[PDB]
Amino acid sequence: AQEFITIGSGSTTGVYFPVATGIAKLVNDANVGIRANARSTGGSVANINAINAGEFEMALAQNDIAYYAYQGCCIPAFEGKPVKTIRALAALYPEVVHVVARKDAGIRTVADLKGKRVVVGDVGSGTEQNARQILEAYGLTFDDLGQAIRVSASQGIQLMQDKRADALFYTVGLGASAIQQLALTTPIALVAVDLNRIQAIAKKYPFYVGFNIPGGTYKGVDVTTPTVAVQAMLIASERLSEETVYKFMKAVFGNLEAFKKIHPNLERFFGLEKAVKGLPIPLHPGAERFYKEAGVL
Ligand SMILES: N[C@@H](CCC(=O)O)C(=O)O
């Protein structure tokens, strides 16, 4: 318990939080000199800013946001100043853009969001970035919305449940508690996001891939949902030593069975081979060593 590691995540009812919490517990149980804890946050942007500032040693973040940060481009949060202090540890699972709408709000498509009260994501979230890009693909801006609300997942579904919001965006792994919870109490529907419309701007944002949310994933949503997704990644500060990261990797990913128990998305989508597939930023030296020894690299 000599070296402290705080892992930035997201809303407590998202997927980043339980994954980070599980990862922290697993590394702590390994007794390798690391004392880890997860911290709820606004998401990808907030997490990357925290790692750069030296506040967090690790964090979960979307591959697209990590790329923009490392390159100092593409989104207002990082344009003009690259964040070269972040390194990738592993690609984890697909993060799907969920566009949730109350059935009584007159919303069947993204275009219908015009004049509506929409939760666009949390402050410092990756979700907000995707929402802004997707809305533009449909000819809209936050100003065209009735209200552009930035709150946590728990606050967001509360607004939806009390009818103070009409729709909500959430770039998150399938099965997020926040969405499951909302589906059980409120009549909701998932709005589609056309990949082709997105493809029209794929040159600016190349990380989107087509993704179908299986019918029955959430209560009351029995039809499949055609949308888009990016990739969740575990990242770390370049400042962490190779030895520390290497020990961490063996304690967390070295125990694959234990790791997959952390969340259904890991059991369903995680694999060491895919963990190093199409990474947007450089792997941390400690992770490279782990993957080389595992035969993955
Ligand atoms: N990818 C989302 C967070 C999703 C989650 O918390 O599971 C974001 O960066 O805003």
Side-chain angles (χ1 to χ4, degrees), residues 106-172:
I107 301 172
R108 292 299 177 84
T109 73
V110 174
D112 295 321
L113 295 178
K114 180 185 298 172
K116 305 295 182 302
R117 298 166 298 177
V118 183
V119 172
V120 300
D122 206 352
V123 175
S125 67
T127 297
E128 191 187 326
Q129 311 313 310
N130 301 132
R132 187 184 60 252
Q133 306 176 334
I134 291 172
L135 283 172
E136 181 172 58
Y138 280 84
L140 304 179
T141 67
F142 282 6
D143 279 3
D144 294 311
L145 302 177
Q147 297 195 312
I149 306 166
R150 298 177 177 66
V151 291
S152 71
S154 291
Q155 210 170 326
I157 61 173
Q158 173 267 301
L159 292 176
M160 289 284 282
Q161 295 170 314
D162 294 326
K163 302 184 181 188
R164 297 173 63 186
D166 304 304
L168 173 149
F169 279 77
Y170 202 9
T171 299
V172 62

Side-chain angles (χ1 to χ4, degrees), residues 32-48:
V32 296
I34 294 175
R35 172 65 175 179
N37 72 295
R39 167 64 77 79
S40 61
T41 71
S44 295
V45 175
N47 292 343
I48 289 169

Side-chain angles (χ1 to χ4, degrees), residues 12 27 45 56 58 214 228:
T12 58
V27 64
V45 175
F56 292 166
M58 293 185 177
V228 301

